[PDB]
């Protein structure tokens, strides 16, 4: 019910489902972006996952316990987006991040474009550790997209 | 509204992967509601 892995986040009412995002189950905690769930509870099979920690400024939320993903981009190496697009199987895409330069420091950023419901897909280092989640970013002049590598703090 | 999760795979680095995308160097600001914007 909380087995480790990457998951789709779906919504359904009376008709079919829609994939609104993706997230990571690790160490019994589900990790996704705030804009995917708006910080609301999730169903997993017969069970309920309750929000535990989150921050709208970071655009992150964890379920069942505190944020567990602590790996950091090394600022140097290529990474992989494990993209889980709506209606498509999970695929690994390797890229060298660029940089979001902010007044509070630099953040790695990936220039990869996927549908909105791919939000929350994990970005990985060469050891397979999740160094952040995809989907909070900017649209540049030509209409293409750059996502921050958004990572929480493991307290 | 039923918001629910479904497993979609294992989290593994793929050896010999497709490398793509550029590496843009952008000046951005982040507001208190989580929006990034270009400066």
């Amino acid at each position: 019910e909380t087995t480790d892995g990457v998951y789709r986040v779906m919504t359904r009412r009376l008709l079919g489902s829609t994939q609104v995002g993706v997230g990571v189950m690790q160490e019994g905690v589900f990790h996704t972006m705030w804009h995917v769930t708006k910080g609301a509870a999730l169903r997993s099979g017969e069970g309920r996952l309750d929000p535990y920690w989150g921050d709208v400024k970071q655009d992150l939320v964890s379920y069942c316990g505190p944020w567990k993903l602590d790996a950091a981009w090394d600022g140097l190496s290529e990474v992989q987006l494990l993209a889980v697009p709506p209606g498509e199987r999970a695929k690994n895409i390797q890229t060298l991040p660029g940089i979001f330069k902010t007044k509070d420091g630099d953040i790695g950023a990936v220039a990869l474009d996927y549908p909105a419901g791919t939000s929350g897909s994990p970005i990985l280092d060469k050891c397979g550790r999740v160094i952040g989640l995809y989907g909070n970013g900017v649209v540049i002049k030509n209409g293409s997209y750059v996502s921050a590598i958004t990572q929480g703090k493991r307290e | 509204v039923d918001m629910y999760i479904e497993r979609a795979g294992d989290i593994t680095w793929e050896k010999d992967a497709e490398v793509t995308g550029n590496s843009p160097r952008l000046d951005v600001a982040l507001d208190e509601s989580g929006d990034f914007s270009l400066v």
């Binding site: 972006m33 804009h35 474009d113 996927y114 549908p115 909105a116 791919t118 939000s119 989907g135 909070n136 970013g137 900017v138 649209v139 997209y145 | 929006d35 990034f36």
Partner: peptide, 4 residues
């Protein structure tokens, strides 16, 4: 983005 098919910014979020």
């Amino acid at each position: 983005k098919x910014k979020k």
